Scaffold this active site. Sequence first.
Site, PDB file in Angstrom:
ATOM      1  CB  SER B  43       7.666 -15.124  80.993  1.00 39.35           C
ATOM      2  OG  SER B  43       8.921 -14.744  81.362  1.00 39.35           O
ATOM      3  N   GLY B  70       3.015 -16.075  81.806  1.00 41.01           N
ATOM      4  CA  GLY B  70       1.951 -16.887  81.779  1.00 41.01           C
ATOM      5  C   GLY B  70       0.968 -16.802  80.831  1.00 41.01           C
ATOM      6  CG  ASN B 100       3.213 -19.809  79.218  1.00 43.13           C
ATOM      7  OD1 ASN B 100       3.825 -20.510  79.874  1.00 43.13           O
ATOM      8  ND2 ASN B 100       3.093 -18.540  79.122  1.00 43.13           N
ATOM      9  CG  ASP B 188      12.872 -21.436  85.039  1.00 45.57           C
ATOM     10  OD1 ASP B 188      13.039 -21.394  83.925  1.00 45.57           O
ATOM     11  OD2 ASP B 188      11.803 -20.757  85.410  1.00 45.57           O
ATOM     12  CG  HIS B 191      10.998 -18.564  82.567  1.00 51.43           C
ATOM     13  ND1 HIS B 191      10.747 -19.108  83.683  1.00 51.43           N
ATOM     14  CD2 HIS B 191      10.049 -17.865  81.924  1.00 51.43           C
ATOM     15  CE1 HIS B 191       9.388 -19.164  83.722  1.00 51.43           C
ATOM     16  NE2 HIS B 191       8.947 -18.432  82.795  1.00 51.43           N
TER      17      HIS B 191
END
EC number: 3.1.1.47
Lengths: 212, 212
Positions: B43, B70, B100, B188, B191
């Site tokens: 992402s 992801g 990830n 968050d 990101h």
Amino acid sequence: ENPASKPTPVQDVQGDGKWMSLHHRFVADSKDKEPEVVFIGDSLVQLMHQCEIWRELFSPLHALNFGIGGDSTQHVLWRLENGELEHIRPKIVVVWVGTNNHGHTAEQVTGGIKAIVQLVNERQPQARVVVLGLLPRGQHPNPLREKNRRVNELVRAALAGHPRAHFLDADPGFVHSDGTISHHDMYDYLHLSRLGYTPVCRALHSLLLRLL
Amino acid sequence: ENPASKPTPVQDVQGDGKWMSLHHRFVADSKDKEPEVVFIGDSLVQLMHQCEIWRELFSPLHALNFGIGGDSTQHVLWRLENGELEHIRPKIVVVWVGTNNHGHTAEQVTGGIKAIVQLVNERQPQARVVVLGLLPRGQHPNPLREKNRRVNELVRAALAGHPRAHFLDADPGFVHSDGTISHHDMYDYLHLSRLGYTPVCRALHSLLLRLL
């Protein structure tokens, strides 16, 4: 129990604690601010703050955005029970969640959404509640489109008797006549682009302005 | 085998096929276009297209963005082996993936990144490869920060002997002196916000312009 209505946090299986950090930031936001509108849900709510302007529409309404990517109904229910509705007295709570409830039937997801509306009606009884329909997803016809449609039919029927509960279908028609969703509207066939957000946000803003 | 270097698709456990639809769109993009730069990763790559402007910086370089939220290293490796490098002959391939890879050790993630660089060197031997360091994540000190740092040390040491392989640390210093990451930079704690993207994109654009 219905797993969609049993409140639980998202367990950290990665190790950075980021979901609890997000929830604690939102608890501190409710402690320190006095919003008229609080928005809560999954990434479709969260990324509106960024990825739509938000500033043009929703900022002037005195709004907090408690969207978290990946949340299911039971996670939103837990967050509302565990601090995000304290110290505030909003006029309207906007709920948009359920597309991530994988492994729950449509009826179970609807029960999760009803539990959220009931919790908001208990903790913030003065507030109206807006529930957005789950959007279609996937590039072509698929079971989650049917599931999301069924959730929307059951949620709309559940809210129909409910004066200050409002169902909003914000979908302008993302599924075209050939069965496809364009990546111009949903870049990964789930999350909205800025272009996808425009019609959704305008529909939601028109309703909020009416109600307010 | 190292699971980080064993190419595999992301299995659809939800039912809408969206990951394969994304990959097939990128295969059709490589079939129809002639990029000078292709960006691939997770992402952090994908949302740069949207959430940074991209248009100001990277559009003029004739670029395709194959980021998928992801993805782990093995998913990017599979996508590069299964059509996304066909029909094209880019000057530079930019790789940003590994944050990830949960459940893989830092050494395993580094092996995944090395496998990606090797595949690009076989299929597109004229291209230079840029690998971005994994960013810190989480609001406070945590094991994934240490893991990501260790991946970056091992990847940088692996690429040091490699003329046309370039490691880029794009982190302007997101971890402050009190150990925190601000939500103004990472909304968050993973990101990037638009503000977070600015320094990252400027560092990457300066290097790309140098190399080009």
